[PDB]
């Protein structure tokens, strides 16, 4: 068992303890989707108001 990297201070200390070793989308691109939903939604509302016009 091995202690490593004993870092000390007034507010605390730390160390490591081993027991065995081993063995993106664009800004505009986002907005293109936000508006692709605003349209899909505005369409479905147009069809309703169209259905209601009948």
């Amino acid at each position: 068992m091995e202690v490593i990297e004993l870092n000390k201070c007034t507010s605390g200390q730390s160390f490591e303890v081993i027991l065995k070793p081993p063995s993106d989308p664009s800004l505009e691109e986002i907005q293109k989707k936000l508006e692709a939903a605003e349209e899909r939604r505005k369409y479905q509302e147009a069809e309703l108001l169209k259905h209601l016009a009948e």
């Binding site: 870092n7 605390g12 730390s14 303890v17 027991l19 070793p21 800004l27 936000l34 939903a37």
Partner: protein, 439 residues
């Protein structure tokens, strides 16, 4: 000194935010006025608590925090909160029409209309940072705002602050206190969208903290206030290294370094002890070796799973209060024997330890007893994958019949995005599987 901006989203985020900054103030000795007698670096400083607080000429210490909610009721309570002088109006952002537990409504519909106001209010804090190191995002999986708007915000921050770090505190849904049937939908949806934009995420199953509150605090019907003050004690243990002077987890980069080998597998299981009832006048003082052992008892985990049948990739021990390394290393020597701890064959089978001499503070008049020593273990075990499995089964049950789907489509979202997010999760369970089981 590197600053940290905390972003509190939705009902869960804002209410937990209060439990945290309330606890922060008690630990850093800041008053409800934002005044700090202990502090002498008036106006500005290079102290370690300045990473979470900015300073004003009047001597007020102001949380580096932003609060957002499409509903005004919750954030309104902060404005008239016991801690109201701390925050200034520009920090508290409120809409009027919430997301009705609909991810699509929070991401697409209501989200588009406020994303540029929030980023504006975040930018006003980023321009008060000499060397911003990143963000701490608080939200729920089940909520409309918490799931929907969060995923939107995380996408933007990966653009506006591409090289800065982003960490997550997320509330996993539990029927025992959930208020919607479609929370499993909102959960898978927000995870899929957020996954590449989150460096490290700490999941908290309401179920776990609920039972912990029942079992260890003798509370019959735990309120959110009960659930939150417990969470804050956890969160405090995670962030204390950023707020106080230490050498372990000193900046956000170190979290990814220590806990996250595989970027996608960035959900460390948190375990915490001791949780002691305050109504118990006399409570047995649990020794170091006793609370260190409790870190491996599932009843104390933030998510109920079985680490014994998973493998580890990392494991941190964050002690607070009266603890010396001799008692620690002793207890570590013990546990390797009694307990089933298998690490991956490509990691050292060891532990990173840290101690913070200031002990765990508790809110006066709370349900938690002050203890002299406490520990919070952050173990990146594959057993947490059990939580994804739970969540995914509930998803497939409802989606096979397209139940409630029309609510999402009606917001302009596509029924294909459901399939897109679910098949992404099906890969995560596979990744967890390839890492931690015998073939």
């Amino acid at each position: 000194m590197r600053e940290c901006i905390s972003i509190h989203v939705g009902q869960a985020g804002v209410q937990i935010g209060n439990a945290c900054w309330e606890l922060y103030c008690l630990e850093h000795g800041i008053q409800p006025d934002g005044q700090m007698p202990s502090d002498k670096t008036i106006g500005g400083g290079d102290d370690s608590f300045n990473t979470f607080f900015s300073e004003t000429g009047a001597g007020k210490h102001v949380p580096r925090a932003v609060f957002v909610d499409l509903e005004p009721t919750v954030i309104d309570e902060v404005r008239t909160g016991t801690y109201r002088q701390l925050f200034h109006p520009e920090q508290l952002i409120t809409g009027k029409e919430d997301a009705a537990n609909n991810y699509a409504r929070g991401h697409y519909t209501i989200g588009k209309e406020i994303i540029d106001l929030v980023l504006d209010r975040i930018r006003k804090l980023a321009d008060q940072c000499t060397g911003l190191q990143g963000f701490l995002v608080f939200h729920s999986f089940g909520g409309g705002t918490g799931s929907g708007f969060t995923s939107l915000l995380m996408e933007r921050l990966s653009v506006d602050y591409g090289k800065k770090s982003k960490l997550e505190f997320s509330i996993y849904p539990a029927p025992q206190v959930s208020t919607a049937v479609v929370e499993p939908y909102n959960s898978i949806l927000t995870t899929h969208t957020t996954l590449e934009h989150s460096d490290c995420a700490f999941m908290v199953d309401n179920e776990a903290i609920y039972d912990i509150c029942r079992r260890n605090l003798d509370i019959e019907r735990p309120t959110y206030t009960n659930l939150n003050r417990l969470i804050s004690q956890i969160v405090s243990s995670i962030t204390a290294s950023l707020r106080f002077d230490g050498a372990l987890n000193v900046d956000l980069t170190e979290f990814q370094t220590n806990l996250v080998p595989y970027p996608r597998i960035h959900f460390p299981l948190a375990t915490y002890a001791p949780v002691i009832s305050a109504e118990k006048a006399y409570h047995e003082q649990l020794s170091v070796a006793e609370i260190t052992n409790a870190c491996f008892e599932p009843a104390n985990q933030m998510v109920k799973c079985d680490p014994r049948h998973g493998k580890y990739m990392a494991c941190c021990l964050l002690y607070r209060g009266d603890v010396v390394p001799k008692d620690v290393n002793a207890a570590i020597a013990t546990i390797k024997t009694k307990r089933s701890i298998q690490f991956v064959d490509w990691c050292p089978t060891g532990f990173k330890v840290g101690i913070n001499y200031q002990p765990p503070t508790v809110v006066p008049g709370g349900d938690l007893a002050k203890v002299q020593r406490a520990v919070c273990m952050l173990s990146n075990t594959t057993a947490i994958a059990e939580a994804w499995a739970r969540l995914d089964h509930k998803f497939d049950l409802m989606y096979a019949k397209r139940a409630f789907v029309h609510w999402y489509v009606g917001e302009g979202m596509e029924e294909g995005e459901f399939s897109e997010a679910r098949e992404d999760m099906a890969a995560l369970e596979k990744d967890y599987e390839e890492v931690g089981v015998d073939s």
